[PDB]
Amino acid sequence: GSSAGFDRHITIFSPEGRLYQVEYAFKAINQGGLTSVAVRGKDCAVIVTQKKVPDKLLDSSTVTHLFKITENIGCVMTGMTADSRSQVQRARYEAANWKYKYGYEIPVDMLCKRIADISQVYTQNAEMRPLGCCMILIGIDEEQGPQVYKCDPAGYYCGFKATAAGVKQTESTSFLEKKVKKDWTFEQTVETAITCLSTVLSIDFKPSEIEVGVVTVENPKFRILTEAEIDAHLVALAER
Amino acid sequence: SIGTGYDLSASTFSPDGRVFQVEYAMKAVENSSTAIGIRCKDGVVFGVEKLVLSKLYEEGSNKRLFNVDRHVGMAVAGLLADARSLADIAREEASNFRSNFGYNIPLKHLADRVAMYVHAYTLYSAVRPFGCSFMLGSYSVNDGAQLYMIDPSGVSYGYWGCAIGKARQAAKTEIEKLQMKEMTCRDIVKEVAKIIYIVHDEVKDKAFELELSWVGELTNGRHEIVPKDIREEAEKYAKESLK
Amino acid sequence: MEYLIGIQGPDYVLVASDRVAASNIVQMKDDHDKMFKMSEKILLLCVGEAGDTVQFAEYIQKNVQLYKMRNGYELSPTAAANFTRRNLADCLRSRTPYHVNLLLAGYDEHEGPALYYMDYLAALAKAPFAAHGYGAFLTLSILDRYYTPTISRERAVELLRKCLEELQKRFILNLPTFSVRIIDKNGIHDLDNISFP
Amino acid sequence: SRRYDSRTTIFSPEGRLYQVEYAMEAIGHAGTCLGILANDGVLLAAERRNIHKLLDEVFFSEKIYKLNEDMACSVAGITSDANVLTNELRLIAQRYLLQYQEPIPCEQLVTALCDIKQAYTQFGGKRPFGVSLLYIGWDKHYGFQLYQSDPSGNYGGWKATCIGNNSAAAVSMLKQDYKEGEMTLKSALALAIKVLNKTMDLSAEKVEIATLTRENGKTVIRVLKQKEVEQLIKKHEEEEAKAER
Amino acid sequence: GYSFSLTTFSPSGKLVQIEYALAAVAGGAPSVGIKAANGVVLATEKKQKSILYDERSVHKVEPITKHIGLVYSGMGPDYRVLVHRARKLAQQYYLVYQEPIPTAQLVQRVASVMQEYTQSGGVRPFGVSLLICGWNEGRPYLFQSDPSGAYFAWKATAMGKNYVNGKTFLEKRYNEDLELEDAIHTAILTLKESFEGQMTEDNIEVGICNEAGFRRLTPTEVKDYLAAI
Amino acid sequence: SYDRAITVFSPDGHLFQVEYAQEAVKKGSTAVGVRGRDIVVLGVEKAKLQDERTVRKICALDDNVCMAFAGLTADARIVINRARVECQSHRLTVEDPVTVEYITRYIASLKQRYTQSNGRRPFGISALIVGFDFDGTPRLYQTDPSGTYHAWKANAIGRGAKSVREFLEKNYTDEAIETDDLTIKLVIKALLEVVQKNIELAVMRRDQSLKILNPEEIEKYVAEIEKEK
Amino acid sequence: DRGVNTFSPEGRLFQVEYAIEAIKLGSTAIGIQTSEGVCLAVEKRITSPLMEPSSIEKIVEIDAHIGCAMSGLIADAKTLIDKARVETQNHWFTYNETMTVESVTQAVSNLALQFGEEDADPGAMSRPFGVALLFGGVDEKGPQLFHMDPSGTFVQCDARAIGSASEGAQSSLQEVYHKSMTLKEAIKSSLIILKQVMEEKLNATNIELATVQPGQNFHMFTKEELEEVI
Amino acid sequence: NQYDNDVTVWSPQGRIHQIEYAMEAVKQGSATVGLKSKTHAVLVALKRAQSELAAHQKKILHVDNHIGISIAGLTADARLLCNFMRQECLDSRFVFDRPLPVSRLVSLIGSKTQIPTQRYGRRPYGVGLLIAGYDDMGPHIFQTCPSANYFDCRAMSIGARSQSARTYLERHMSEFMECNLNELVKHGLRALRETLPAEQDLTTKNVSIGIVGKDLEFTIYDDDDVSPFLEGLEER
Ligand code: NA
């Protein structure tokens, strides 16, 4: 794992063909302390993350990692919070701009490819640093059904059956692949995402400790779940 | 502080995924005089421990409270010239909203816009992050009372109570004692002064001057300074409580 | 209004131009030279609008001179005519078009004598003989009548004299003196001015 | 930012441009490429370095580039850098032709590219082009010409020159067997194969020759075919064997 | 921005950032190109880290225009930049000449962009090598463009992890007169030389180019090629 | 654009890039200039396979002015061409041709600017500018990477400028400025003190053009130098 | 490396500090302001008999009533001299009058910290000017002599010396200067002090002398005039 | 060591050393004093000479009819800032036909001088000013510094040995508002004096005064103009 010149300071190749500054941006995602899970069902797509509000002095409704990009597209950001807000503003811009030029709402994959391409620029130009954050987008495609996409500070992007980001990403993915190996209803999809975050963080959740976001084939508008709606899922999982 | 080149630019991450230039800029706020803001049932109130650097200065020099818009107020902590440059940005942001949409900029929206001008200075070797943290307060019938805070990183959160500076944590454990959600701006002013006097270090620091401002139903949603009458009454209670 | 003429022989180019510099109804100058030596074997005869002529001709002259200094050899009459053409045509659709009408005479060691015609629009034509100005309407037919490609220089001067005499008899403009010059294997030779006293 | 700046356009304490000198080093690693001027024409002989069995051979050449109706060139160095420079050479030749309606005289085309190469050494903060060129041509002023230019933007006219791998050895070998004014394309082609044989570690697949001649008042540029080149190396092999006997 | 080059000549005469970009390519998943008599094949390893990935969502074998196709070894996000640029360049040619761009012409235009990132200020070279296939003037074409901006016309070649072995395999295994059907079987076999795991129609990707233009093979088409071992 | 200060002051008050540009001048071929009464002679120091015409270091800028150089040849070409353009642009603006001082002041101004503007290194050349003014006075000047310029009776620049200057200081007499051939002999004798077909001389007599003598003509003077000793 | 606009821990820009050190390498020049006019004198510092002494012009005329003495990098001075001459003629054009000595000195002075790298014009200065100037001239305020250095700081002087032997020449000036001394005595003191500080002996070729007095225009002393002074 | 080079670099202490180095320029200049009464604003400065033969540098410059300044630091930066102030004042009278309110001018100085403190390759202004003005809020004394921070002052002193002037201004602070012009100028002259070594006293050569107030436009007194004021001070 060698270094030569300014390969650990700027986005220029290392002797092994690596981009150390991009590698460091992945470590910045974990600096936030949070973990996020996203699962794709038969007729739905859910996103879930931790909701750490340590002082009662905060206004709990302003503390969020879930965002509405468009009416039918939502996202869960993981990493450096301001870097995350910046990416959400750009995602919103690119999406509104797309409908303006093309007369149709941006596909989930196109918005993910777009944000990923913007992120790649930072990976090639030295005068700026990558964003220390991970974006996961959900939405219902008119012809392809539910979609779950994620993009990296590296500029990579992909579609997923289920995905994770943050501190316990490795463990969350290990868990998510074990359940997908062994029918994905809306309840089955919500319960899986909640119990992935819970078993991986070893925390039996309270309704204020997590935030759930969902898109449904019946109602494709990105919906963020209430504490009561979150509790109805939490209690039904405990019944089992 | 990792002194190996990884901390000289905001376009450079350290191996553990940190941007030290932003952290060093946050340390300028950590060395600053404390500013506090409290959101209550009918408005938002600001109070600042404005340390008196010289007996030669005028009463009210170096105001750490600004009017960003007719309904928005700003309480700063950190490098004052950066703080005042952010006041001008926020002012122009509010001015541009009215020119675009014909009505007063919603506080959450102003906080979001200004926090992204702050964020922008945390990505490049070409520019320096702002060595400043600030709060925005507002009150309207439609939106209610709103208090937000932005840090050198560009993060913007909504608050019921907030403190920034040297005594950031000490002020917070005192603000936590108050049940603001059920209080008025006439009652909460007395408490803001009490908290600022408690948090002040008479030994390590020299004399200080208390700056008090508010925006609420009592002011018709306009950001104003607390009149001399009410300020003297709150300072009298703050000194009497200390004993 | 002004007059330019060229007659190319087998091994030379004969050129002549009026000597009048006139403003309004007055003849300000009787001894005005309208030919600009570009090279040792190239002359650019230029007429047209008030300022445009000296401005355009001198720009080309200094650029042909810069070529000589830069490369050690001169432009050929063909390259110098096409370079004149490129600049004139490039200004045509610009804010500042040049109203200049010209003839480029020259002698090349490889291609021999060449005479070119160019109007203000920058159309370039190689002609055995040419004329610019209202005078060309009275003299192109005299040249059509008597010009032959084997015309000796002595004969071409009698032909040029027949054209200049025609302008005295029929042209309403007073053009009494003309500059006469021959370009050949040995360069530009000044001949006696054809005068009408 | 000052920290990350390479300082590519600055002088060293002894009045040296290090980037220009390090670009020369790159050219020494590139294939050997020679040029020989003769009375009836001028030639270019270069070592092919794309010499693998699975290569397709879509183009007429590898190192030989036609620039003009009357001019061609060969390169030694960074091939992508050489593509930029040869493409610019073609644009300069057409800008001259459009303006004067005569083809660009050989030395003028070389100077124009050398002025771009020189600019890369004096300003901009960019690295130079890692290429040396050998130009062959014909013009109405100096006839058959052979030029050479390097990354410094310096150029010169030559009767025989070499650039690339073992350039130094080839110039000493060319210096000894070259006969000023008495050279013909036939004898110079024999000399080209004699030199490349010693400066390489040779078959028609490993070499690539091109000639510039004057046929009926028009210039003829032609890269020689494998069977032509094969006969020229077979002929050398015969004279070399009959030298010991 | 940073107006100075980030790729400079080392004292030995090497453009070290280009050498380091080639290392990124040599560590990428393997890719193969084979020029058959009546077509061209492009094959790659599309093996993802977990079952959770949706393989159908992103592609390694991409179309440029109707008759040109593309594949790579190296940095995935860098590749996407060159794909967009290549598709744009192919439209600029078609708009002017009203004729499908010759493959040599596309490859030279794409290779010039790659050279740009080795000299232009404040940028690093692309960490990718492309394998460009096409069909024009009734014949197939196979090119490779590397991070320096240099291009090569190949009859058959390998890139990425275990390319030295794949190239020796290709040289000995097949030559000219191969039919496109045969060549796809060869491309799959050269991928099998350095394939850790069971090969499926989801962890490999193939694209073909013939008289009918370029197109990516469907997983059902790849499945029938894998049925023949 | 590249906004970086290249030439700056060092703690001892030096402009190091200009002194490094003077070290590049010191490595160039020796150039001698002698100012006569009705003539001005410039001479330079000198491969068998090279074309002598393409490597000449005496250049005519215009009919009245011509110059010689020492240092970076590619740098010198850019200065020589910018001066050639300024001679014609001067005749276009003013009506009169350039005075030997005007173009020297011009070249010097260009040189100075490259020592004080961003992203540029100084020109690694010195020049000896000879000619006659419109009044007919013979003038010899000298410029250097800094931008400073002065007039001279005789001067030398390049590899061995110190020893040729020492010779010319002791040998520039009114007897040597008497006949045109004695002025030419001073230049050849001065160059013979550093160089060993190794000289290139150019002469300018009052109204006639710059005459570049041939090698046989040079050998005519070289033979008489050995005889007079 | 550090930026050209970097401050030293003492509060001075390093580039300006070093530009002042460059002046310590330049030829020594003296100026004396008298009721009867200002005198300017400078050593040419000739390095070869082959060099034309006339081609060294260290005393220049800015306008008919203003002269300039320079020291340091004489190529850097040539740019500021032209800027001064252009300034006087633009003022003459706009206002139909002459400039005061101070106004000209201030104009040249405004170009001093106009150097930099980032955020500057496409043809901006990278470094300061390594020159010191003495502006001696006459206006309505009488004879005036001004000093200027690379920091843009200009001051009015009764007597000033700049260059290699600045310390010594100023010491000598201080002991002999009186506010009511004649211009004849001012020239003599300058020529004596200049003779003292030079390595080479004083000659009519070796030095430059010039005066500006009411009722006369900036005068550059000829060899014949300099011989009768020496 | 590493955090000294550029203004965009924050030290691990949350400090910007380039800003602190620029402020050292103010501290190296000669002392200047500014003070105000209920009707007037006074500026006094010890002009310092480079030798007996050289003159004492101009320490006080005109900005507008109602505003005048005294400088301490880089004289070229002081002239850049003076022309910005003069121009901002011209704009206000051109547009509004009313003098630019002194506190507003000072905000513009704080705003424009902050810009370089946050851009790479840029440097702070190496000058600090004392501003004397008069408007609808009476007389004012302001202080600007390389930091881009500014202060509204009752009295003030910047430069070398200025801390000595500050103690006189703090001790006599109470008398300033009810002071007449002669007495207010005396308070300033006396604070200026305390800076100068016990070796030297104020002189008609090395003293500069600037006065603005209720009926007087900004006026600069320099040599025999200074004499009336100095004709009362004579102890220590
Ligand atoms: Na980057």
Side-chain angles (χ1 to χ4, degrees), chain B residues 219-234:
Chain B
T219 61
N220 296 285
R222 299 189 191 172
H223 187 246
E224 295 189 341
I225 185 171
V226 166
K228 220 176 293 182
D229 293 19
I230 306 179
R231 176 172 58 252
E232 287 152 6
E233 183 193 29

Side-chain angles (χ1 to χ4, degrees), chain C residues 17-32:
Chain C
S17 55
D18 76 288
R19 312 224 295 156
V20 182
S23 189
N24 207 43
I25 69 174
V26 315
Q27 213 162 295
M28 293 186 127
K29 278 187 79 187
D30 287 18
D31 57 357
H32 180 58

